[PDB]
């Protein structure tokens with residue numbers, strides 16, 4: 207449930223039409239944490255299980271509490287891991303539409319990797335959802351070099367990490383409803399806009 211390696215375990219012959227790459231929060235389990243699987247369930251209902259690949263960011267991404275203090279909200283090693291997953295999706299399945307997401311430190315990681323991506327690949331990312339975006343205030347609510355209309359930020363009232371401080375209050379732990387509904391909904395809508403039916 208909390209670990210999905212569909213891209214890593216996939217190949218060109220079985221390519222899905224949609225590939226979702228997701229980065230968990232600090233200290234979360236597996237490579238999807240608490241929010242990732244909910245998004246996944248929704249995606250799988252919309253596209254079939256065969257029509258979508260779910261991939262969490264693992265490897266060098268350890269989701270360390272200390273890394274949040276680094277200049278871009280995570281280590282440069284984690285940034286290289288996620289960037290490498292986008293490259294792999296492009297290599298294995300050039301025809302697939304990409305979608306991404308991240309929670310807390312994972313939101314900073316998602317933003318950093320996307321900012322750094324080759325524009326050709328970044329163009330294929332139809333939508334990105336961020337929850338408890340630690341760099342929300344600093345990045346004025348968006349991802350550098352990526353279109354705003356493609357980005358959706360979920361920041362609860364009272365979630366201090368959205369207002370510039372690294373302080374965890376209960377609202378930061380309350381994104382389950384968003385992950386279960388409006389987040390995957392937005393993603394499906396963007397993929398449908400670039401693919402149709």
Ligand SMILES: *P(=O)(OC(C)C)OC(C)C
Nearest residue numbers: 231232274310311367372
């Ligand atoms: P994020 O990495 O979130 C986890 C606590 C879930 O937290 C920062 C604000 C320390």
